Design a protein around this ligand. Structure first.
Ligand SMILES: [Mg+2]
Ligand SMILES: [Mg+2]
Ligand SMILES: [Mg+2]
Ligand SMILES: [Mg+2]
Ligand SMILES: [Mg+2]
Ligand SMILES: [Mg+2]
Ligand SMILES: [Mg+2]
Ligand SMILES: [Mg+2]
Ligand SMILES: [Mg+2]
Ligand SMILES: [Mg+2]
Ligand SMILES: [Mg+2]
Ligand SMILES: [Mg+2]
Ligand SMILES: [Mg+2]
Ligand SMILES: [Mg+2]
Ligand SMILES: [Mg+2]
Ligand SMILES: [Mg+2]
Ligand SMILES: [Mg+2]
Ligand SMILES: [Mg+2]
Ligand SMILES: [Mg+2]
Ligand SMILES: [Mg+2]
Ligand SMILES: [Mg+2]
Ligand SMILES: [Mg+2]
Ligand SMILES: [Mg+2]
Ligand SMILES: [Mg+2]
Ligand SMILES: [Mg+2]
Ligand SMILES: [Mg+2]
Ligand SMILES: [Mg+2]
Ligand SMILES: [Mg+2]
Ligand SMILES: [Mg+2]
Ligand SMILES: [Mg+2]
Lengths: 118, 181, 81, 25, 66
RNA sequence: GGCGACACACGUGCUACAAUGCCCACUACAAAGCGAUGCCACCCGGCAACGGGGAGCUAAUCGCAAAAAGGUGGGCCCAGUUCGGAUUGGGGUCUGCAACCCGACCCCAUGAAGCCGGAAUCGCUAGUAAUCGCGGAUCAGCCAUGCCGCGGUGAAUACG
RNA sequence: CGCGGGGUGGAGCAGCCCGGUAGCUCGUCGGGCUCAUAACCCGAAGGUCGUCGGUUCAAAUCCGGCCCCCGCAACCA
RNA sequence: UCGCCUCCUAAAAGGUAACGGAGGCGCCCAAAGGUCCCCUCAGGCGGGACGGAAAUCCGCCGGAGAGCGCAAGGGUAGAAG
């Protein structure tokens, strides 16, 4: 069933299918699994709506996920920009923001290559 | 069935709060809620008119009415579009059936919207009716989520006999419409 | 990251802590870009050195945990050809 | 793999210890 | 409403994050809703759980004591 | 402050794209080096980095030390995935007068490109090539995937 | 003046006829092979279709004006 | 250039010339025909997911500027659309 906005995990395995939520994976999963006293080894296909609603209630209440989570990391960076801050500039120009020589491949952050003449 | 909770809730505590607030002399002058028109601009399905009967089937399911199929008005080249072809489905509800849907929408659909910090306060059209767009259709209860092949939204038009938005907002708030203030 | 810490240089720390309790506020040129900023810094106009000159940087409440050289960048760019 | 710092194999490679490679013998 | 080619629309029972709605009156009776943002969680009867605006708020606290 | 720049181009590399593989628990087997301005067992606090305490050793006499692969056992079921961990957000530890520019590391979230790489091109003939860990120099710390070394398991194939 | 043809990536041709998609050779750029250059190999970038106006859903393509280009003709006097 | 159609020249009936000014035809439609019933445009402002000057949807204003297979003219929503 569906948690945190919509975000339906299905089948698979319950501690794994928990990763598929925004803001959650590994730790934050195997934690709320016993905290709600639920077997992690089970499969989200079948389980009592009991262990289902106990499970959404925890998670959706505990921490912020999905929309509001992304909205927070947004305004966090918006904050780094427009405060004229260094890291802000590296966000403003879409260049690597920590350490990181840019003379050669930044590519993940820089985009694919745009070649020019010698 | 002529009962329909929210319908009741309109006469039996929305109307009075309205007369009290705007000071209406005549029984009619106090705003009535008529005709919510759901319309899928579906031009997504353009060449495939097969996709459409799935989408029309789904509207019926969440309305109680099969929608009219709109057709293209003028032929326009920039995106495909022969003059004849179907653009989308468009369905009119009123009178009970509008309420029984408008109830379900208010208590179920809009809740199920990802995020949702509330309905836009500026969408009133100035002669005091209200339009609002939706993106995915699985936020309705009648949808099983395994019956969606693709995701088609709709524009929703709510027409009211209020002569201004100030009055139209009030009617709609008091009915329980979650405005973003 | 320090914590038992929050290193600020004592040189400007003086002239700032003064400009509260002296009552008066104005433009103060410092070389110390290693230092952290605020609380009694906010609203002061501090000139930070980039290696070349002193850059005016206005101060506000979300500049808080940020070192003084964040706001004085060291390299001139404007892109390529 | 040897670059997942969140794994056993990774930690060993970077040479470090933690929740994924706690030091016990 | 023309007879034939139509969803049934029969009185129903519907549940959710908190209670029911005896109202129902829908096609496909007895349906299961995820959460009504109004059980008054989620922004209505404003909960404002796990609130924002801590980032200008925190950097001032661990900051000048140490 | 810069040598750490970033529209770009090349050389040497590392981690991979997974099921002869990934993760978790348990169980084994090395060599060569280093350290009483240091190496720190063992105990406690901490998810952890680390911090408190604190015994031994001028060291075949104490410490770095867990070797890793392997072994057993269970999990994953071919999925851009329990593959892969780049990027970024927040939280911290440490060295150091000082980590904005530029440190290493820990946790939480984020999880990108990548499904064996055009033309072309490198190394290796045996305890070698592949693959797996380990130590030292420099050194406060460290950008070491480097360099110099040590052992573990261990192919293929040479008509000519 | 007259009649015919043309004007499109940097160069030279196609596409217009029959509306909807611009192509081919060279050149240019990045890589490769070479001690090195050329030759050669693997990749890419590049045109708004002379111009204005018109028709159509839509114009390089059909129509009209003008601006160039080449060819032809200008006889009895 | 040569037959046909529309406008002007044409001097407010008709007709009216020039190697006067401008454009079209040599088709098309089995629905684009007959009839009965119903419906009314273009455009402008506001509102509405993907929808952008423009796809579709909802409000108001809009006597015809739209449409009438193709050129122009006359005509036409009290319909010819
Ligand atoms: Mg770095
Ligand atoms: Mg750098
Ligand atoms: Mg409004
Ligand atoms: Mg109204
Ligand atoms: Mg992994
Ligand atoms: Mg260098
Ligand atoms: Mg080179
Ligand atoms: Mg390397
Ligand atoms: Mg891919
Ligand atoms: Mg730095
Ligand atoms: Mg695969
Ligand atoms: Mg390769
Ligand atoms: Mg040999
Ligand atoms: Mg090493
Ligand atoms: Mg030509
Ligand atoms: Mg070349
Ligand atoms: Mg050459
Ligand atoms: Mg022309
Ligand atoms: Mg045109
Ligand atoms: Mg074209
Ligand atoms: Mg003669
Ligand atoms: Mg006359
Ligand atoms: Mg006359
Ligand atoms: Mg003619
Ligand atoms: Mg008929
Ligand atoms: Mg209109
Ligand atoms: Mg509009
Ligand atoms: Mg007309
Ligand atoms: Mg006409
Ligand atoms: Mg007319």
């Amino acid at each position: 069933a569906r948690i945190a906005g919509v975000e339906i995990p299905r089948n698979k395995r319950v501690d794994v299918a928990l990763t598929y939520i925004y803001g959650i994976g590994k730790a934050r999963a195997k934690e709320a699994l016993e905290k709600t006293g639920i077997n992690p080894a089970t499969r989200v296909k079948d389980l009592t709506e009991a262990e289902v609603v106990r499970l959404r209630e925890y998670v959706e209440n505990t921490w912020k996920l999905e929309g509001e989570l992304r909205a927070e990391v947004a305004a966090n960076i918006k904050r780094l920009m427009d405060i004229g801050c260094y890291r802000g500039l590296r966000h403003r120009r879409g260049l690597p923001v920590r350490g990181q020589r840019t003379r050669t491949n930044a590519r993940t952050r820089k985009g694919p290559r745009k070649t020019v003449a010698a | 069935p002529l009962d329909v909770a929210l319908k009741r809730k309109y006469y039996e505590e929305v109307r009075p709060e309205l007369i009290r607030r705007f000071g209406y002399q005549n029984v009619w002058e106090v705003p009535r809620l008529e005709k919510v028109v759901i319309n899928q601009g579906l031009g997504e399905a353009k060449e495939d008119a097969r996709i459409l009967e799935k989408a029309a089937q789904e509207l019926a399911l969440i309305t109680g009415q099969k929608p009219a199929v709109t057709r293209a008005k003028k032929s326009i080249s920039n995106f495909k579009l022969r003059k004849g072809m179907p653009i989308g489905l468009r369905v009119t509800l009123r009178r009970d059936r509008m309420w029984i849907f408008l109830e379900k929408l208010l208590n179920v659909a809009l809740p199920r919207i990802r995020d949702f910090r509330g309905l836009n306060p500026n969408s009133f059209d100035g002669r005091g009716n209200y339009n609002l767009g939706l993106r995915e259709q699985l936020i309705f209860p009648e949808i099983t989520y395994d019956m969606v092949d693709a995701l088609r939204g709709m524009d929703i038009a709510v027409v009211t006999t209020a002569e201004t938005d100030e009055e139209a907002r009030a009617l709609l708030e008091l009915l329980g419409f979650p405005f973003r203030k | 990251s320090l914590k038992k810490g929050v290193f600020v240089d004592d040189h400007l720390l003086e002239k700032v802590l003064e400009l509260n309790a002296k009552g008066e506020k104005r433009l103060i040129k410092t070389w110390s870009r290693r230092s952290t900023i605020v609380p009694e810094m906010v609203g002061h106009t501090i000139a930070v050195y980039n290696g070349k000159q002193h850059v005016p940087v206005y101060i506000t409440e979300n500049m808080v945990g940020h070192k003084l050289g964040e706001f004085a960048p060291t390299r001139t760019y404007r892109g390529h050809g | 793999g040897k670059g997942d710092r969140r794994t056993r194999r990774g930690k060993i490679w970077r040479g470090t210890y933690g929740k994924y490679r706690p030091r016990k013998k | 409403m023309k007879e034939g080619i139509h969803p049934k629309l029969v009185p129903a029972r519907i549940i959710c994050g908190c209670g029911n709605v005896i109202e129902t009156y829908s096609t496909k009776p007895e349906i299961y809703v995820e959460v009504c943002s109004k059980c008054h969680p989620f922004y209505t009867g404003q909960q404002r759980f796990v609130d924002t605006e801590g980032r200008v708020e925190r950097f001032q606290r661990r900051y000048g004591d140490s």
